[PDB]
Amino acid sequence: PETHINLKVSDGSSEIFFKIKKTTPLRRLMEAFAKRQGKEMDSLRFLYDGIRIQADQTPEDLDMEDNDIIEAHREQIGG
Amino acid sequence: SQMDIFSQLSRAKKGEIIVID
């Protein structure tokens, strides 16, 4: 229930499913997704609800509901 | 000009998992 949360990070091509405590900084999650991609952490941006997720923030204060999708795109000049 | 809500409803209708704690 209140314990954890499950999240998907999709780069449009592939996915990864994640379990983390609602209070954990997303930094790790983001890094985990980056390495499993073989990309540089700073070469992609993680969008959520239209905002640009910041490594510092946690799912809790982002209003994250179970099985939310997080969008990773290449760091470029908008779509 | 405004349109009708129904004629618009008519026209309209017609495997890894990583874990961190």
Next chain:
Amino acid sequence: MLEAKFEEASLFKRIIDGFKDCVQLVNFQCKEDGIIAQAVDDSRVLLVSLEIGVEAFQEYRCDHPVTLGMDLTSLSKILRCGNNTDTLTLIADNTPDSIILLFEDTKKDRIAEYSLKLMDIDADFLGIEELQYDSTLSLPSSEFSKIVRDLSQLSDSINIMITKETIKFVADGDIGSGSVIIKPFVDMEHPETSIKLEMDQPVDLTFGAKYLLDIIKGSSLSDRVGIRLSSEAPALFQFDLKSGFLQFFLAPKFN
């Protein structure tokens, strides 16, 4: 049969009052797990849909789906002859042609009960599968209200326009234009003041401001509003209530 008991007749009156700002008639679809109040505005452009969940009621019972087509005048008339603090009970059988409201003062053993003849209403035909949505934003409902009150002063129509990182509201009077541009944002200090945008398709619609002016009254009920627009589909505005959901479906205007 149908037996719906509100703890306070005023709760029901509040509902009836809300509706009386937009519509004359409501259809009360009573299903086994709550009631879905449905109405269409007189000019046939706005569609309101209220979902009174079961825990909203003091005691609910529906042995079989019935539709109670009511006239909001009549209903308000009956509600006068009742005290806001009385319990209210709607009583109907499996195929009604008439309903009974039953007011009950518990602290005195007073019981009052009036009949109401039902009628046929076309908002029985609200069979929207909710469809699907190019874009979906959500924002503080009063913030949305402020915007609407401002630009509705400029013009008879308002234009919403969504883009990968931009919601842009605009109105053009022959006395002045004006426009708001908002951007998805979050803060930890006040999470509930946040703007969430989920875009899949740039959208650009225009709505009659008077309708938007009705729609915004929902803000008293919910401190956030969800907006879902799609190219050629009615826009959805919706407010979460504790025991249900208020929803408007508004047709955009064509060019």
